Design an enzyme around this catalytic site. Structure first.
Site, PDB file in Angstrom:
ATOM      1  N   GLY A  81      13.124   3.504  -6.294  1.00 39.89           N
ATOM      2  CA  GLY A  81      14.180   4.088  -5.742  1.00 39.89           C
ATOM      3  C   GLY A  81      15.315   3.178  -5.247  1.00 39.89           C
ATOM      4  N   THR A  90      17.851   3.309  -3.325  1.00 38.44           N
ATOM      5  CA  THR A  90      18.298   3.425  -2.088  1.00 38.44           C
ATOM      6  C   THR A  90      16.782   3.235  -0.987  1.00 38.44           C
ATOM      7  OG1 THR A  90      20.002   4.976  -2.424  1.00 38.44           O
ATOM      8  CG2 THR A  90      19.028   5.198  -0.079  1.00 38.44           C
ATOM      9  N   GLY A  91      15.992   3.954  -1.178  1.00 45.99           N
ATOM     10  CA  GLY A  91      14.667   3.936  -0.854  1.00 45.99           C
ATOM     11  C   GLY A  91      14.354   2.178  -0.739  1.00 45.99           C
ATOM     12  N   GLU A 123      -5.980  -0.077  15.225  1.00 45.85           N
ATOM     13  CA  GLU A 123      -7.200  -0.335  14.690  1.00 45.85           C
ATOM     14  C   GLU A 123      -7.065  -0.461  13.197  1.00 45.85           C
ATOM     15  OE1 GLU A 123     -10.331   2.293  16.150  1.00 45.85           O
ATOM     16  OE2 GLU A 123      -9.810   2.101  17.953  1.00 45.85           O
TER      17      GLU A 123
HETATM   18  N1  LIG Z   1       4.840  11.925  -5.231  1.00 45.72           N
HETATM   19  C1  LIG Z   1       6.326  12.171  -5.250  1.00 45.72           C
HETATM   20  N2  LIG Z   1       7.186  11.249  -5.538  1.00 45.72           N
HETATM   21  C2  LIG Z   1       8.455  11.187  -5.749  1.00 45.72           C
HETATM   22  C3  LIG Z   1       9.368  12.386  -5.142  1.00 45.72           C
HETATM   23  N3  LIG Z   1      10.357  12.319  -5.422  1.00 45.72           N
HETATM   24  C4  LIG Z   1      10.652  11.097  -6.056  1.00 45.72           C
HETATM   25  N4  LIG Z   1       9.577  10.317  -6.150  1.00 45.72           N
HETATM   26  C5  LIG Z   1       9.289   8.943  -6.874  1.00 45.72           C
HETATM   27  O1  LIG Z   1      10.581   8.272  -6.461  1.00 45.72           O
HETATM   28  C6  LIG Z   1      10.660   7.282  -7.633  1.00 45.72           C
HETATM   29  C7  LIG Z   1      12.055   7.246  -7.662  1.00 45.72           C
HETATM   30  O2  LIG Z   1      12.783   6.766  -6.569  1.00 45.72           O
HETATM   31  P1  LIG Z   1      13.493   8.034  -5.446  1.00 45.72           P
HETATM   32  O3  LIG Z   1      12.719   8.017  -4.178  1.00 45.72           O
HETATM   33  O4  LIG Z   1      13.649   9.096  -6.335  1.00 45.72           O
HETATM   34  O5  LIG Z   1      15.014   7.095  -5.313  1.00 45.72           O
HETATM   35  P2  LIG Z   1      15.693   7.089  -3.866  1.00 45.72           P
HETATM   36  O6  LIG Z   1      14.604   6.616  -2.831  1.00 45.72           O
HETATM   37  O7  LIG Z   1      16.585   8.344  -3.653  1.00 45.72           O
HETATM   38  O8  LIG Z   1      16.704   5.847  -4.326  1.00 45.72           O
HETATM   39  P3  LIG Z   1      17.810   5.843  -5.441  1.00 45.72           P
HETATM   40  O9  LIG Z   1      17.310   5.056  -6.400  1.00 45.72           O
HETATM   41  O10 LIG Z   1      19.105   4.890  -4.954  1.00 45.72           O
HETATM   42  O11 LIG Z   1      17.943   7.302  -5.814  1.00 45.72           O
HETATM   43  C8  LIG Z   1      10.238   7.910  -8.665  1.00 45.72           C
HETATM   44  O12 LIG Z   1       9.364   7.185  -9.596  1.00 45.72           O
HETATM   45  C9  LIG Z   1       9.052   9.175  -8.488  1.00 45.72           C
HETATM   46  O13 LIG Z   1       8.076   8.890  -8.778  1.00 45.72           O
HETATM   47  C10 LIG Z   1       8.196  13.247  -4.369  1.00 45.72           C
HETATM   48  O14 LIG Z   1       8.723  14.131  -4.129  1.00 45.72           O
HETATM   49  N5  LIG Z   1       6.966  13.393  -4.534  1.00 45.72           N
HETATM   50 MG   LIG Z   2      18.437   9.102  -4.572  1.00 45.74          MG
END
Ligand SMILES: Nc1nc2c(ncn2[C@@H]2O[C@H](COP(=O)(O)OP(=O)(O)OP(=O)(O)O)[C@@H](O)[C@H]2O)c(=O)[nH]1
Ligand SMILES: [Mg+2]
Ligand SMILES: Nc1nc2c(ncn2[C@@H]2O[C@H](COP(=O)(O)OP(=O)(O)OP(=O)(O)O)[C@@H](O)[C@H]2O)c(=O)[nH]1
Ligand SMILES: Nc1nc2c(ncn2[C@@H]2O[C@H](COP(=O)(O)OP(=O)(O)O)[C@@H](O)[C@H]2O)c(=O)[nH]1
Ligand SMILES: Nc1nc2c(ncn2[C@@H]2O[C@H](COP(=O)(O)OP(=O)(O)O)[C@@H](O)[C@H]2O)c(=O)[nH]1
Ligand SMILES: [Mg+2]
EC number: 3.6.5.-
Lengths: 25, 439, 430, 430, 439, 25
Positions: B143, B145-146, B254
């Site tokens: 992701g 943003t993440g 730890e």
């Molecule tokens: N296990 C799990 N994985 C998730 C979930 N939501 C998103 N993902 C994982 O997140 C990945 C995509 O990144 P995102 O977190 O959706 O994107 P973002 O953090 O919003 O950042 P952007 O790319 O800008 O949208 C995917 O490959 C998913 O596997 C969730 O609710 N549970």
């Molecule tokens: Mg997003």
């Protein structure tokens, strides 16, 4: 009159960073 | 007593945070409005959740969390959900355009617009704490943003505080399943920028959770719901040592003391056991030794990889509930006796154990049967080197033709950054290859 | 929040967008009066992305209508949903294009573009956060082609950091509807390849094939083809309006789907598609949608994708589904048909899931494919255009509007270079 | 679980399979609407082996209808059970075969086989575990023969590890219904002996003899003969659907019944068979079923099995029975008539028992015999075919479709070699 | 205390397992839901069934069994039957295509797909045991899935454990009755591959059981029901020495110690007495000597053969119920005095005896009348050499023309395997002929 | 123009394996 942008990519010689062998002696 | 700030970044961050806070409110008996149905003590006591929930007003518990995202939809879903009246309105920070799975955007272009506000809110929350010990960051590598905003925030927090522990729970890119085409670049750039600024990042995998659900939970359609619930169970089992008194308590420091042999190898793999459906719960006697043995089965790893391909450097066994220390001793001795599990020669003492009295709690309408004891295991093994090599190979395949590169370059991501990240990832692979050689 | 400025130009623009606004107003519970009479909060949660609220429970669609002859606009204004549109945005000329791209781009468009751009600026300044511009138009049509190229150039200069999406009706491989369609298409793409972010290619002939074959329709109309195109358009931007397990805005699609700046054309698809009688004999599962999407007969583009390879694949699903199911189906697709994907892109498929299904369906999915096979369209266009240009076929009609031979020459050379680039990226190279 | 793809081709295919699906829908409690309205859980326990469930309690039979003229398909669609079949699987041409195998195999089948195979792949990908393919068709019929040979070759290439079962209507020893039936039969077996796993030989003349003789019928119809054939077909695969004391799937039958790869033709039989009046005077015991099965007049094949010897015998029983009783009856049969079994195969009889009897019967049994006596059929076919070919009888009708004399020559030579192999395996040798 | 894992392979395996577990639940008073109607002790005690039933939850007994088949119909019948809530759901393993009575399929092609899962489940069950002594495998020679998968599993278990006893209960191919045309090949191949990896395989015959039912039980229509019930009675009488305290207890190792004179001759014949219908039960006085004498009558052998044609090498007499050891002593002396029963000269001490106090229990709705004493007898005699010669003759007759051979060859069964198996069977016949010659 | 696939099959000379006579001396 174009050509694909292909580059010769290589990580030639990369050494480790953790000195796991620094005290092997 | 002790305090920890939970930071949720991106889609996966906010969703896993929703699941985690639901589980915490269930465990501590905190109603969705911050009230307690047994609100007999206000503003102190034990009441050990003072770590995660601050005491305000009279009888209202406020979670110590900060939700950050550049796309307002998921934060609005939080703002209109069940726990909309639980969280402080100033804890929900939103941009107006997400990073489009572009690490360059979230790291340079868009992240710089709200990073200051996020850091100011984090400082305001930390100034209310007295024994702040660690920061929890939930994010996914793929992701944008993440990835980008997490890299930026990790750098900023490492600069600002320095000596506070920094733990990450992150969704490793699945070996086969993908959701974005540019996951390799985002993952490589995020890892390169994040490596030296994280104390311990715990790896999970959605594909492994799919397999675990299908095999153990007997569920054919496990959407993100079951994934988030399992991740929340793991996080709660990790924080239970702080939240509840145990026979052998384990703080947050730890973990990085016991799991990180070298400053550059801090990627332990999470596992969880027992994971059984309610149907087979009455045909099973869940002893301590059986859960301990099931923890080391390759079919129960939260990350798709083969632990038999590498060696273990450190393993942390966190038990909860009706657990006898003698049985744990014997089970660890048996695991060490098992010749199929290999540990590095330079680590003759490869186990760390912790036992808490609080048994796990099942969410109503959940999937897992109620058990009197459970074990959360965190192991640092060299098996993830193959996954790192796979990611590096995908990055090379995409970068030899400069695929998607203009998208990052336009945002200010100079091209040499990719070469630097690639060399650093090769160096990480070399580190794993060297530490895995006996002498 | 994010807002989309929908620009309608040409006959395709007007008709397709009338059907599109019908569908959108139905999805959000907006009756032909503009007053909200829906039944769910999510209809108004993101109503502002395509609507402006004038106090009084009335919502105005953020749309701009552009044409060079008032006939189509009169037909639109007098038809259904005529009174919801604020009459400020009916911007039309008087001469018409006569299917001459040169005319519509250098004289009539040159006269009307100032008013059109003033309307665009008015609608953009009122926005909270402008996200991107969507243009519906045809390529063979002189009005559509010329006015769209001019407007896209001007707006790209005005907002260089916004998303420029176009849904273009492309020439058919067998049945052309305009004598001068090849020149209009060549001169149109000569600017679209430079100023647009992504273009979805719709062929009317493929839609006719789908209508007679899959839907078992005997009397299909341009309006029903517009209904299919509008279902696709609504599926494209379902994440900008409703929440879901995994959302994806327009910029995310542009990033994940365009590997190199010039190869931005995409082939759209839709699923499920069934006749009325066959609905009672087929269940709606994710494997069913996956098999319908990755089917040559369900591609709305005028090309068999099995002749080339894919670079990027977008699959946006609607309705309650299992993510494990969708991911397993995508894995099966990539594994069984690995020879149809370029070797230099691992993980070829991008996915997204919205929790709100279309009206009347349990589940659906919208297909967006970036295949090298689309080089067939551009190669056929170049061949026909070269054959016509060697004899100066209808050339005076364009030279009388100010064009010289050099502009046609440069357009054709750029077209040949684009075809050559698509052919270059079919080499595995590894 | 295990699934069977039923392919219907030709007039025999369409009619016999319509009656077959009537019987199968009756056994599983599926009314002509596709909705389940049965009374036992075992009806739905293995409903998926022949049905696809589309949500809404509706079940669709996994059947594919193939023909070269839409008349028979119109008759099937307009008759009983027309609306249960999903209309996706009515795949027909327009020219018809004209009883010419060459036509149906090289021109009309060559044009329609792509659509038929696409339908086959669609039905196969939706399966959970594809077990085998069942084909109902005639040999004398040009459509049946040619389309079946082509489809069997293509599907055998597509799935070389699945079970290929065919139920073929063979030429009658006295009354032929087609002038060019011998050539169609020769050219059909020339491919069936190479691509199929097992073929059940049904003669209409033997069915007429059984109808006038045993059932005491005065006006038998092709539909009632199809009812008998469908009862046999349902008895063959009763173990794929209901539990029992001893089950046997299709691969078990293929293994136990085919000693050598080319000698895979079988003679089917059925018991009990009684007229309506005689039902009140005869009890249903295992000895009765055993005596009715091993009876020359109850063989549905055009040959007296007492002229040769058996290699393998399959006897699948239905209904609550004693295994000791069945085993003692089989011992008595093998001991009293040991001269009718080849000496090089001890334990000639294979058995299986399903606990669910047919509708209206306390007990029944299906006979499947692999006898060398069937060489009479192939020898008569070779003699008639040679006599016709010496004068080039109707040869131009086949040479006009692309066939040469060499194809007929190779077919006849292979037929003579098959007859010689059956004759070779009549030697005791010990 | 001691433990034993019951493995049921194939159609006959699963059906005999259903019968056996019904009989065990009846004997120990365990309700079909794993509960006890007299559930006064939970999780231990004696309660001697700890061998066969593991203690889980609180008051639920779980049988230590593993049901394996490649065709899911019989396992589903178990999954929807009376004891569907008794067995653990993870104990029922299914493929999706049975072996079609082709040993090659079940041994090479299909068995290799689930053999790993079966072995993993077996290891998980064995790791819960502390005094694991033996493995019980139920299978038929003729059945392809049974035959092939049993051969594969026997090899794998012999490799994995080695020193644990391996007992087999198997349905010998009847001399006249057959259910599959290719029973000779499957039987010969299975015997050749299984011989050196089995400690003791007990022979039974459906035709002999037909004759026994008709003569003794006076039943004209004895389907697989009565066969399975008699087999279950024999198995329960064999395991009663472990499950109940007796005047002279016999473990599982004593059987192969006393019945196997040479490593290649380990095929004892099972018998059972008394077998009387309820109608003649009140016209009969079942003394110890009478049951002992009836045990050695050729008309009561569970395998169709003539024991008078050969000699006995070892005979085990297992008594149950109201049994006086002096009467057993006198009856054994009388049997040895009987000059019509011949024993090998090199075995002057040819009897082994065991007496358990627990009387046999009749299944409600069963066929056998209730008796205060019963005798299960297991005898190793050279009379089965004639049956081996008959099987070898049938194999030669079918193999001289390569009948059905392409079916096995296509699955990867190289042709030389048949020659090797034939020579090994000839060597077994030579062994029987040599050990039966006095000197 | 075919012939049955008949083979001359024999277990010619097979010796026992159990050394039942090894200590006869
Ligand atoms: N296990 C799990 N994985 C998730 C979930 N939501 C998103 N993902 C994982 O997140 C990945 C995509 O990144 P995102 O977190 O959706 O994107 P973002 O953090 O919003 O950042 P952007 O790319 O800008 O949208 C995917 O490959 C998913 O596997 C969730 O609710 N549970
Ligand atoms: Mg997003
Ligand atoms: N006594 C007894 N014998 C049985 C029973 N069920 C099957 N058999 C014997 O098993 C033999 C056939 O082998 P099966 O066990 O049925 O076949 P399988 O183990 O399922 O393996 P496959 O050949 O692949 O089906 C027959 O000769 C029967 O005599 C039973 O319930 N009781
Ligand atoms: N799908 C669709 N295509 C249309 C429709 N109307 C016109 N077209 C196509 O557009 C082309 C005509 O160009 P047009 O835009 O009408 O002429 P213009 O006035 O110069 O812009 C023809 O090739 C038609 O196939 C419609 O309602 N739906
Ligand atoms: N048992 C049975 N046989 C049929 C039926 N209809 C036709 N036949 C036989 O099939 C042969 C006719 O071939 P057909 O398949 O109709 O011609 P095609 O169009 O070339 O395939 C004749 O010999 C008939 O005896 C039927 O309903 N039942
Ligand atoms: Mg079986």
């Amino acid at each position: 009159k174009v050509q694909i942008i292909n580059k010769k990519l290589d990580l030639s010689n990369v050494q480790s960073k953790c000195g796991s062998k620094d005290n092997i002696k | 007593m002790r305090e920890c700030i939970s930071i949720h970044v991106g889609q996966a961050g906010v969703q896993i945070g929703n699941a985690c806070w639901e589980l915490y409110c269930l465990e501590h008996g905190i109603q969705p409005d911050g009230q307690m149905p047994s609100d007999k003590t206000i503003g102190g006591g034990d009441d050990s959740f003072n770590t995660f929930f601050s005491e305000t007003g009279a009888g209202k518990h406020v979670p110590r969390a900060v939700f950050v995202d550049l796309e307002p939809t998921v934060i609005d879903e939080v703002r209109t959900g069940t726990y909309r009246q639980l969280f402080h309105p100033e804890q929900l920070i939103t941009g107006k355009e997400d990073a489009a799975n572009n690490y360059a955007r979230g790291h340079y272009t868009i992240g710089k617009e709200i990073i200051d506000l996020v850091l100011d809110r984090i400082r305001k929350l930390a100034d209310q704490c007295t024994g702040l010990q660690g920061f929890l960051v939930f994010h996914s590598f793929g992701g944008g943003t993440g990835s980008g905003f997490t890299s930026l925030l990790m750098e900023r927090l490492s600069v600002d505080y320095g000596k506070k522990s920094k733990l990450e729970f992150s969704i490793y890119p699945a070996p086969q399943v993908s959701t974005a085409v540019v996951e390799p670049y985002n993952s490589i750039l995020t890892t390169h920028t994040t490596l030296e600024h994280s104390d311990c990042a715990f790896m999970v995998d959605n594909e492994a959770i799919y397999d675990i659900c299908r095999r153990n939970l007997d569920i054919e359609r496990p959407t993100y719901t079951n994934l988030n619930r399992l991740i929340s169970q793991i996080v709660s089992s990790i924080t239970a040592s702080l939240r509840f008194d145990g026979a052998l308590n384990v703080d947050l420091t730890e973990f990085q003391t016991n799991l990180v042999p070298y400053p550059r190898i801090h990627f332990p793999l999470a596992t969880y056991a027992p994971v059984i459906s309610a149907e087979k719960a009455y045909h099973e006697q869940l002893s301590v030794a059986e859960i301990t043995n099931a923890c080391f089965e390759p079919a129960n790893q939260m990350v798709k990889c083969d632990p038999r391909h590498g060696k273990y450097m450190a393993c942390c066994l966190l038990y909860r509930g009706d657990v006898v220390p003698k049985d744990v001793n014997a089970a660890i001795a048996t695991i060490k006796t098992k010749r199929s599990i290999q540990f590095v020669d330079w680590c003759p003492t490869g186990f760390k154990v912790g036992i808490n009295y609080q048994p796990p709690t099942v969410v109503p309408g959940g999937d897992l049967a109620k058990v009197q004891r459970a074990v959360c295991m965190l192991s640092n093994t060299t098996a993830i080197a193959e996954a790192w090599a796979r990611l590096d190979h995908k990055f090379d395949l995409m970068y030899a033709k400069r695929a998607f590169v203009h998208w990052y370059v336009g945002e200010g991501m100079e091209e040499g950054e990719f070469s630097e990240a690639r060399e650093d990832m090769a160096a990480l692979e070399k580190d794993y290859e060297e530490v895995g050689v006996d002498s | 929040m994010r807002e989309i400025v929908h620009i309608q130009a040409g006959q395709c623009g007007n008709q397709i967008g009338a059907k599109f606004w019908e569908v959108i107003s139905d999805e959000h519970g907006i009756d032909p009066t503009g007053s909200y009479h829906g039944d769910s909060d999510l209809q108004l949660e993101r109503i502002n992305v395509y609507y402006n609220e004038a106090a009084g429970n009335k919502y105005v669609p953020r749309a701009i209508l552009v044409d060079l002859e008032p006939g189509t606009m009169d037909s639109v204004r007098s038809g259904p949903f005529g009174q919801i549109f604020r009459p400020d945005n009916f911007v039309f000329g008087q001469s018409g294009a006569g299917n001459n791209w040169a005319k519509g781009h250098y004289t009539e468009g040159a006269e009307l573009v100032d008013s059109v751009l003033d309307v665009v600026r008015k609608e953009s300044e009122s926005c909270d956060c402008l996200q991107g511009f969507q243009l519906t138009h045809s390529l063979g049509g002189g009005t559509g082609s010329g006015m769209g190229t001019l407007l896209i150039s001007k707006i790209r200069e005005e907002y260089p950091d916004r998303i420029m999406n176009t849904f273009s009706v492309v020439p058919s491989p067998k049945v052309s509807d305009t004598v001068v369609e090849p020149y209009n298409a060549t001169l149109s793409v000569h600017q679209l390849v430079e100023n647009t972010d992504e273009t979805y290619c719709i062929d009317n002939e493929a839609l006719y094939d789908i209508c007679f074959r899959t839907l078992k329709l005997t009397t299909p109309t341009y309006g029903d083809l517009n209904h299919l195109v509008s279902a696709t358009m609504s599926g494209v931007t379902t994440c900008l309006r409703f929440p879901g397990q995994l959302n994806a805005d327009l910029r995310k699609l542009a990033v994940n789907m365009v590997p190199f700046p010039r190869l931005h054309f995409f082939m759209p698809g839709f699923a499920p598609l069934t006749s009325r009688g066959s609905q009672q004999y087929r269940a709606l599962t994710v494997p069913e949608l996956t098999q319908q999407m990755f089917d040559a007969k369900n591609m709305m583009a005028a090309c068999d994708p099995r002749h080339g390879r894919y670079l990027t694949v977008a699959a946006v699903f609607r309705g309650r589904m299992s993510m494990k199911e969708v991911d397993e189906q995508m894995l099966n697709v990539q594994n069984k048909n690995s020879s149809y994907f370029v070797e230099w892109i691992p993980n070829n498929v991008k996915t997204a899931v919205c929790d709100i299904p279309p009206r009347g369906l349990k589940m659906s999915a919208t297909f967006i494919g970036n295949s090298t096979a689309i080089q067939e369209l551009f190669k056929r266009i170049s061949e026909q255009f070269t054959a016509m240009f060697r004899r100066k076929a209808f050339l005076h009609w364009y030279t009388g509007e100010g064009m010289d031979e050099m502009e046609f020459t440069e357009a054709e050379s750029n077209m040949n270079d684009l075809v050559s680039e698509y052919q270059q990226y079919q080499d595995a190279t590894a």
